[PDB]
Design a protein around this ligand. Structure first.
Ligand SMILES: Cn1ccc(-c2ccc(Cl)c(CNc3nc4[nH]c(Cc5ccccc5)cc(=O)n4n3)c2)n1
Ligand SMILES: [Zn+2]
Length: 343
């Protein structure tokens, strides 16, 4: 229970601090790519959004480039609630226009082109490009260190209608904090469902996790140490280890860490009191996460945290057979003190 889990977490800490010069190298490579991209006309206002994608793989990094687009006209695609076309009312991005719709594909292509020419331009460190919508471009710094650069439109207008009932943090973080978060911009990233774009709130997880308690002083002193971050880390690591166990099969290909995050923040809404995440109760709180996740698999309901009407576990998205397979795997694990945490 709690002791075994804390040992898993200390192991993860020793793994992650594998000389964190990888962070400095990716910082440099990204600062160079941005330095070149801001020269081109189609990419004048590009920037960093603010970052690890895997806990078991401290060499796999993830970075997002924002590109502000004012006076943007969003058109929902076929009742999806999640995908949109980008339109306009001269234009800097006139190069990517196809009719009135803004082509993700043309945009991504000029992006990749600029980045390929500039990685060849750097004759100091070894950087290789691989092409496979999101992630947009994946790069390899010198060996084993991989960086996934994504491109996003940024809109500083109010969030689209589909998110109205979403971000249900009022009982936990507060109504005040929900309102101030919704005043932050929102993002769009290429993703096929068609030149459809998809809503993106990757900047909100950081905001919530850095200020995560109902008490403003949570995790700021000895008496108020909670285990929320640790439970999220263990849920990410649980899914990652199961996916590694079946990497040669497709059984789990359709589950991702964002299913884990969605379920975790639902449990945070369910369990708003800091008293329900006491550090001492790690084993219990984690069990709370697992059970909830299991319940979502069995009921085939996992609402997206921002667009509640979009079901991430809909039968039209993930197979019932995959959902039962992961159900059985997770249940075995919880019944056996999670041996998968051991490689
Ligand atoms: C990566 N993928 C692949 C498909 C989608 C996707 C599918 C449907 C919708 Cl409706 C959306 C809407 N957009 C969206 N949903 C999330 N969920 C979190 C996870 C999270 C939850 C709660 C608090 C913080 C973070 C991260 C994130 O960045 N987003 N972005 C995104 N996403
Ligand atoms: Zn805390």
């Amino acid at each position: 229970g709690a002791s075994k889990l804390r040992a898993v977490l200390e192991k993860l800490k020793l793994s992650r601090d594998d000389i964190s010069t990888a962070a400095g190298m990716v910082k440099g490579v990204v600062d160079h790519l941005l330095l070149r991209l801001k020269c081109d006309s189609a990419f004048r206002g590009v920037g960093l959004l603010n970052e690890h994608v895997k806990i078991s793989a401290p060499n796999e990094f993830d970075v997002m480039f924002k590109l502000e687009v004012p006076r943007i006209q969003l058109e929902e695609y076929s009742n999806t609630r999640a995908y949109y076309f980008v339109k306009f009312k001269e234009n800097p991005l006139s190069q990517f226009l196809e009719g009135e719709i803004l082509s993700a594909s043309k945009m991504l292509s000029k992006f990749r082109k600029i980045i390929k020419e500039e990685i060849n331009d750097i004759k100091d460190t070894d950087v290789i490009m691989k092409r496979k919508g999101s992630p947009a471009v994946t790069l390899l710094i010198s060996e084993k260190i991989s960086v996934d650069i994504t491109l996003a439109l940024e809109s500083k207008s109010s969030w689209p209608a589909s998110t109205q009932e979403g971000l249900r943090i009022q009982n936990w973080l507060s109504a005040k904090v929900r309102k101030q978060l919704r005043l932050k911009p929102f993002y769009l990233v290429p993703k096929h469902a068609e030149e459809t774009w998809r809503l993106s709130f990757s900047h909100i997880e950081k905001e919530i996790l850095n200020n995560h308690g109902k008490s403003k002083t949570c995790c700021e002193n000895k008496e108020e140490k909670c285990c929320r971050k640790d439970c999220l880390k263990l849920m990410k690591y649980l899914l990652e280890q199961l996916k590694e166990r079946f990497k040669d099969k497709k059984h789990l290909d359709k589950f991702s860490s964002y299913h884990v995050k969605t379920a975790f923040f639902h449990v945070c809404t369910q369990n708003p009191q800091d008293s329900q995440w006491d550090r001492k109760d790690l084993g219990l709180c984690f069990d709370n996460c697992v059970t909830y996740f299991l319940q979502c698999l069995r009921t085939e309901k996992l609402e997206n945290y921002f667009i509640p009407e979009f079901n991430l576990f809909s039968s039209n998205l993930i197979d019932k057979r995959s959902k039962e397979f992961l159900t059985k795997q997770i249940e075995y694990e919880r019944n056996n003190e999670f041996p998968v945490f051991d490689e």
